[PDB]
Amino acid sequence: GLFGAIAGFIENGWEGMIDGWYGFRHQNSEGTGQAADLKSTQAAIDQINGKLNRVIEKTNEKFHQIEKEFSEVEGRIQDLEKYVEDTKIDLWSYNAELLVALENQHTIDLTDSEMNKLFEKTGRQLRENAEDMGNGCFKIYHKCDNACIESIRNGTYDHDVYRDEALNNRFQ
Amino acid sequence: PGATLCLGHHAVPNGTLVKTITDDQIEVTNATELVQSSSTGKICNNPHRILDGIDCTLIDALLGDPHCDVFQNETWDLFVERSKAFSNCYPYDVPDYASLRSLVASSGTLEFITEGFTWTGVTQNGGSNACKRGPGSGFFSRLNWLTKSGSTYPVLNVTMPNNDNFDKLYIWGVHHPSTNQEQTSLYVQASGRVTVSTRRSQQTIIPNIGSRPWVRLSSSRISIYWTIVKPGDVLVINSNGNLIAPRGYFKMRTGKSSIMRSDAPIDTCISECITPNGSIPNDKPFQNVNKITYGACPKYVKQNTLKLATGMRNVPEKQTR
Ligand SMILES: CC(=O)N[C@@H]1[C@@H](O)[C@H](O[C@@H]2O[C@H](CO[C@]3(C(=O)O)C[C@H](O)[C@@H](NC(C)=O)[C@H]([C@H](O)[C@H](O)CO)O3)[C@H](O)[C@H](O)[C@H]2O)[C@@H](CO)O[C@H]1O
Ligand SMILES: *[C@@H]1O[C@H](CO)[C@@H](O[C@@H]2O[C@H](CO)[C@@H](O[C@@H]3O[C@H](CO)[C@@H](O)[C@H](O)[C@@H]3O)[C@H](O)[C@H]2NC(C)=O)[C@H](O)[C@H]1NC(C)=O
Ligand SMILES: *[C@@H]1O[C@H](CO)[C@@H](O[C@@H]2O[C@H](CO)[C@@H](O)[C@H](O)[C@H]2NC(C)=O)[C@H](O)[C@H]1NC(C)=O
Ligand SMILES: *[C@@H]1O[C@H](CO)[C@@H](O)[C@H](O)[C@H]1NC(C)=O
Ligand SMILES: *[C@@H]1O[C@H](CO)[C@@H](O)[C@H](O)[C@H]1NC(C)=O
């Protein structure tokens, strides 16, 4: 995809994450753990629900039309009736093919985008107290107990608290 | 010793392949089908008024073939013609059959209003053993076969004005005898003629004497014609022989009515969309069941499947086996 996260700098997905679409894995002093991010998960789902409801919007009701099967050979008039229907069907078949192609390219790009948005947001929270390893993982340069990890995940992490501790570990 | 925080996304064991701008097949976590490719095989009886033609074409119900008498004055949103239908009255053709069938199908009704036409100096209510009605000879219920009275068939000249505020549809015909003997025996004159006119249009039909193939006891034929008379206009019928007269007119409507060829049984259910294969759901935007549809239907396309991705790219962890 256009952002290079999913199937890009993030090596693979997590079959283990069953409670969300995007999220966090950590290792700290207390062990390892996993948690889904709800906001990014919901942003993707809402956008996909949006396009689904646009696509499945019932928009044509037709009653008396032209005949489309014929028991007798007739020539000119029947040739035109068939050609009209065959022309229509081909155009609709093309629209359908293009629609899914565009929709699916975009769906992949927007999911890739949402992964990237979460990553950049996290990077910005951590300010100078962490570094991008380049594989979707931040090395945090300080003691980050489960309270501290959950602070990053639920958006309350104050970087000034750990800045001195972290800056020292980074450049020493 | 500090800490690591990894960002990531889900994956699933069983993904689906979809098409994109760049890939004809690529794997996502989920997708949903946009093409309806199946039917129950049954036509739902709601919400459209379905009329099963059973043994009858719409045209035979219109004309009043006796085994189609049960269709008198019927109405429909969708008239369904069955492959088992048969004619069992006097043999006939309709020049522009397809148009008469279309306009009646679209009108959505066979409501017939009898009018007191005065046919001076001819015999009325002619019948044939080709068209039995009970034990004896009979005829199309809506047509009146006129033949000589005594030894004369005079010039028939009649009028029926339309002083209603709706259009009248008149169905009439012309008898084509097989022999000159038959022609003169029924109509006296050696060559008949039927002229049916309004202020704006006219139709003149000359009969044609000659054998056609034997159908239900007769080498003769009747040809069926129609004339619409608008409010303020007037019907005139002029003939010196071979007229198959109307007994009245059919009421015309405009609306959502149509006709479909299908052998699907009618069942008790609710479906907006009807195909000859049966009813289909309309939750999907496209369908591959049949290009013939009636109602609120997905649009017919050639593909039997199109998958809309409903999730991200599915990337399993590189496996060791
Ligand atoms: C009208 C008349 O005088 N008819 C005599 C015929 O009945 C008779 O013989 C047979 O006619 C057979 C077909 O018959 C009918 C019919 O059922 O179709 C008898 C109807 O009453 C008559 N209807 C009217 C309104 O006249 C009808 C009509 O003439 C024709 O259908 C016109 O196409 O004919 C069958 O063909 C037999 O092969 C035939 O022997 C004939 C011959 O004796 O005499 C007629 O006087
Ligand atoms: C065959 O039947 C038709 C239908 O009735 C006859 O048409 C009628 O013919 C008369 C003239 O012979 C028309 O009369 C005229 O009417 C106006 C009024 O608008 C009047 O001011 C004139 O002085 C004139 O008398 C009449 O309108 C007409 N009717 C229709 C409905 O067209 C026809 O004459 C008959 N022919 C035969 C040979 O029987
Ligand atoms: C719906 O019915 C039509 C026929 O009424 C089916 O199409 C026919 O079947 C095969 C192709 O699958 C061909 O040999 C015929 O010539 C087809 N006829 C026409 C007119 O196209 C169609 O497959 C049916 N579909 C379903 C889902 O039942
Ligand atoms: C995936 O989509 C299907 C329809 O194709 C739907 O029935 C199902 O609920 C969805 N599955 C998941 C795991 O979201
Ligand atoms: C058909 O309907 C008309 C009124 O619309 C009525 O005059 C006629 O008797 C009806 N015939 C039958 C057989 O129901």
PDB file of C-alpha atoms in Angstrom, chain A residues 6-7 10-15 17 20-28 48 52 55-56 58 60-65 67-69 85 89-90 92-93 96-97 100-105 107-108 111 115 118-119 122 136-140 142-143 152, chain B residues 1-13 18-22 26 28 32 34 48 101-102 106 256-259 261 272 282-283 285-286 291-297 299-303 306-313 315-318:
ATOM      1  CA  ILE A   6       1.046  -3.116   6.352  1.00  0.00           C
ATOM      2  CA  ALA A   7       3.070  -5.642   4.341  1.00  0.00           C
ATOM      3  CA  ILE A  10       5.620  -4.100   9.737  1.00  0.00           C
ATOM      4  CA  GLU A  11       6.715  -7.639   8.842  1.00  0.00           C
ATOM      5  CA  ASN A  12       3.376  -9.290   9.455  1.00  0.00           C
ATOM      6  CA  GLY A  13       0.039  -9.321  11.225  1.00  0.00           C
ATOM      7  CA  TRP A  14      -0.926 -10.867  14.525  1.00  0.00           C
ATOM      8  CA  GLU A  15      -3.365 -13.790  14.353  1.00  0.00           C
ATOM      9  CA  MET A  17      -5.048 -10.115  18.221  1.00  0.00           C
ATOM     10  CA  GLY A  20      -9.165  -5.311  17.415  1.00  0.00           C
ATOM     11  CA  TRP A  21      -7.592  -4.443  14.050  1.00  0.00           C
ATOM     12  CA  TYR A  22      -4.588  -2.434  15.245  1.00  0.00           C
ATOM     13  CA  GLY A  23      -2.727  -2.435  18.527  1.00  0.00           C
ATOM     14  CA  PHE A  24       0.241  -2.721  20.821  1.00  0.00           C
ATOM     15  CA  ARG A  25       2.698  -5.398  21.939  1.00  0.00           C
ATOM     16  CA  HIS A  26       5.168  -4.527  24.723  1.00  0.00           C
ATOM     17  CA  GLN A  27       8.084  -5.945  26.667  1.00  0.00           C
ATOM     18  CA  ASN A  28       9.067  -4.334  30.000  1.00  0.00           C
ATOM     19  CA  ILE A  48     -15.331   0.462   5.465  1.00  0.00           C
ATOM     20  CA  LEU A  52     -20.216  -0.758   2.028  1.00  0.00           C
ATOM     21  CA  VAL A  55     -22.175   0.433  -2.620  1.00  0.00           C
ATOM     22  CA  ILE A  56     -25.217  -1.633  -1.465  1.00  0.00           C
ATOM     23  CA  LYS A  58     -30.615   0.080  -3.685  1.00  0.00           C
ATOM     24  CA  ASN A  60     -32.984   0.798  -9.534  1.00  0.00           C
ATOM     25  CA  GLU A  61     -36.525  -0.475  -9.826  1.00  0.00           C
ATOM     26  CA  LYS A  62     -37.682  -1.461 -13.334  1.00  0.00           C
ATOM     27  CA  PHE A  63     -41.037  -2.763 -14.520  1.00  0.00           C
ATOM     28  CA  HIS A  64     -42.072  -3.130 -18.196  1.00  0.00           C
ATOM     29  CA  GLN A  65     -38.960  -3.157 -20.391  1.00  0.00           C
ATOM     30  CA  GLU A  67     -38.132  -8.547 -24.456  1.00  0.00           C
ATOM     31  CA  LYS A  68     -34.717 -10.223 -24.201  1.00  0.00           C
ATOM     32  CA  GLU A  69     -35.313 -13.786 -25.437  1.00  0.00           C
ATOM     33  CA  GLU A  85     -29.316  -5.293 -24.074  1.00  0.00           C
ATOM     34  CA  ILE A  89     -24.894  -5.514 -19.849  1.00  0.00           C
ATOM     35  CA  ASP A  90     -21.326  -4.928 -21.018  1.00  0.00           C
ATOM     36  CA  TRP A  92     -22.751  -2.485 -16.326  1.00  0.00           C
ATOM     37  CA  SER A  93     -20.280  -5.407 -16.157  1.00  0.00           C
ATOM     38  CA  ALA A  96     -18.920  -3.401 -11.592  1.00  0.00           C
ATOM     39  CA  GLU A  97     -15.332  -4.515 -12.359  1.00  0.00           C
ATOM     40  CA  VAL A 100     -14.449  -3.220  -6.969  1.00  0.00           C
ATOM     41  CA  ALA A 101     -10.936  -2.533  -8.268  1.00  0.00           C
ATOM     42  CA  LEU A 102     -11.016   1.114  -7.121  1.00  0.00           C
ATOM     43  CA  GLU A 103     -12.793   0.315  -3.862  1.00  0.00           C
ATOM     44  CA  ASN A 104     -10.334  -2.482  -2.967  1.00  0.00           C
ATOM     45  CA  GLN A 105      -7.191  -0.537  -3.840  1.00  0.00           C
ATOM     46  CA  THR A 107      -9.512  -0.076   1.197  1.00  0.00           C
ATOM     47  CA  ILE A 108      -5.966  -1.488   1.298  1.00  0.00           C
ATOM     48  CA  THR A 111      -6.072   0.418   6.266  1.00  0.00           C
ATOM     49  CA  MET A 115      -1.729   1.707  10.796  1.00  0.00           C
ATOM     50  CA  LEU A 118      -1.318   5.158  14.917  1.00  0.00           C
ATOM     51  CA  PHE A 119       2.442   4.695  14.559  1.00  0.00           C
ATOM     52  CA  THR A 122       2.724   7.034  19.206  1.00  0.00           C
ATOM     53  CA  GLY A 136       7.048  -0.957  13.963  1.00  0.00           C
ATOM     54  CA  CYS A 137       8.740  -1.116  17.394  1.00  0.00           C
ATOM     55  CA  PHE A 138       9.905   1.724  19.615  1.00  0.00           C
ATOM     56  CA  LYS A 139      12.772   1.079  21.989  1.00  0.00           C
ATOM     57  CA  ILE A 140      11.820   3.095  25.074  1.00  0.00           C
ATOM     58  CA  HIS A 142      13.438   4.056  30.586  1.00  0.00           C
ATOM     59  CA  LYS A 143      11.613   1.935  33.173  1.00  0.00           C
ATOM     60  CA  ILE A 152       0.942   5.416  26.380  1.00  0.00           C
TER      61      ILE A 152
ATOM     62  CA  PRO B   1      17.321  -2.265  30.798  1.00  0.00           C
ATOM     63  CA  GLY B   2      14.308  -0.306  29.448  1.00  0.00           C
ATOM     64  CA  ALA B   3      11.315  -1.406  27.333  1.00  0.00           C
ATOM     65  CA  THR B   4      10.131  -2.039  23.756  1.00  0.00           C
ATOM     66  CA  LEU B   5       6.658  -1.050  22.383  1.00  0.00           C
ATOM     67  CA  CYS B   6       5.664  -2.708  19.101  1.00  0.00           C
ATOM     68  CA  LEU B   7       2.877  -1.373  16.883  1.00  0.00           C
ATOM     69  CA  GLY B   8       1.004  -3.828  14.665  1.00  0.00           C
ATOM     70  CA  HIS B   9      -2.203  -5.060  13.095  1.00  0.00           C
ATOM     71  CA  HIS B  10      -4.310  -8.214  13.066  1.00  0.00           C
ATOM     72  CA  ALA B  11      -4.325 -11.135  10.687  1.00  0.00           C
ATOM     73  CA  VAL B  12      -6.571 -14.150  10.258  1.00  0.00           C
ATOM     74  CA  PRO B  13      -5.987 -17.805   9.448  1.00  0.00           C
ATOM     75  CA  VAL B  18      -9.798  -9.809  -4.134  1.00  0.00           C
ATOM     76  CA  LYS B  19      -9.024  -7.748  -7.212  1.00  0.00           C
ATOM     77  CA  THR B  20      -7.454  -4.274  -7.098  1.00  0.00           C
ATOM     78  CA  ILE B  21      -5.932  -1.687  -9.487  1.00  0.00           C
ATOM     79  CA  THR B  22      -2.537  -3.431  -9.309  1.00  0.00           C
ATOM     80  CA  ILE B  26      -4.468 -10.399  -3.479  1.00  0.00           C
ATOM     81  CA  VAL B  28      -7.452  -9.442   2.528  1.00  0.00           C
ATOM     82  CA  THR B  32     -18.373  -9.540   0.800  1.00  0.00           C
ATOM     83  CA  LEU B  34     -21.661  -8.095  -4.647  1.00  0.00           C
ATOM     84  CA  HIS B  48     -46.475  -7.631  -6.510  1.00  0.00           C
ATOM     85  CA  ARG B 101     -49.137  -8.316 -26.016  1.00  0.00           C
ATOM     86  CA  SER B 102     -46.880  -5.506 -24.819  1.00  0.00           C
ATOM     87  CA  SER B 106     -48.349  -2.800 -19.626  1.00  0.00           C
ATOM     88  CA  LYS B 256     -46.098  -0.744 -13.286  1.00  0.00           C
ATOM     89  CA  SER B 257     -47.625  -3.791 -14.977  1.00  0.00           C
ATOM     90  CA  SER B 258     -45.670  -6.199 -17.187  1.00  0.00           C
ATOM     91  CA  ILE B 259     -45.429  -9.791 -18.390  1.00  0.00           C
ATOM     92  CA  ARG B 261     -42.191 -16.001 -19.438  1.00  0.00           C
ATOM     93  CA  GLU B 272     -39.207  -7.217  -4.506  1.00  0.00           C
ATOM     94  CA  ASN B 282     -31.913  -7.399  -3.712  1.00  0.00           C
ATOM     95  CA  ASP B 283     -29.383  -6.663  -0.925  1.00  0.00           C
ATOM     96  CA  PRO B 285     -26.000  -4.273  -6.194  1.00  0.00           C
ATOM     97  CA  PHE B 286     -25.316  -6.797  -9.006  1.00  0.00           C
ATOM     98  CA  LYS B 291     -31.050 -10.292 -17.561  1.00  0.00           C
ATOM     99  CA  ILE B 292     -34.847 -10.517 -17.498  1.00  0.00           C
ATOM    100  CA  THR B 293     -36.045  -8.976 -14.249  1.00  0.00           C
ATOM    101  CA  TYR B 294     -39.105  -7.264 -12.768  1.00  0.00           C
ATOM    102  CA  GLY B 295     -39.080  -5.007  -9.685  1.00  0.00           C
ATOM    103  CA  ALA B 296     -36.375  -3.532  -7.508  1.00  0.00           C
ATOM    104  CA  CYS B 297     -33.498  -5.675  -8.717  1.00  0.00           C
ATOM    105  CA  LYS B 299     -28.280  -4.825 -12.075  1.00  0.00           C
ATOM    106  CA  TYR B 300     -27.467  -7.767 -14.350  1.00  0.00           C
ATOM    107  CA  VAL B 301     -23.717  -8.321 -14.989  1.00  0.00           C
ATOM    108  CA  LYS B 302     -21.665 -11.100 -16.614  1.00  0.00           C
ATOM    109  CA  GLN B 303     -19.446 -11.891 -13.617  1.00  0.00           C
ATOM    110  CA  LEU B 306     -17.220  -9.834  -7.409  1.00  0.00           C
ATOM    111  CA  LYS B 307     -15.636  -9.428  -3.962  1.00  0.00           C
ATOM    112  CA  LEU B 308     -15.565  -6.104  -2.144  1.00  0.00           C
ATOM    113  CA  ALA B 309     -12.767  -6.050   0.413  1.00  0.00           C
ATOM    114  CA  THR B 310     -14.091  -5.351   3.925  1.00  0.00           C
ATOM    115  CA  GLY B 311     -10.704  -5.537   5.626  1.00  0.00           C
ATOM    116  CA  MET B 312      -6.986  -4.823   5.452  1.00  0.00           C
ATOM    117  CA  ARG B 313      -4.327  -6.832   3.640  1.00  0.00           C
ATOM    118  CA  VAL B 315      -0.243 -10.920   6.129  1.00  0.00           C
ATOM    119  CA  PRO B 316       0.409 -14.198   7.952  1.00  0.00           C
ATOM    120  CA  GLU B 317       3.738 -14.568   9.803  1.00  0.00           C
ATOM    121  CA  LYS B 318       6.286 -16.117   7.337  1.00  0.00           C
TER     122      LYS B 318
END
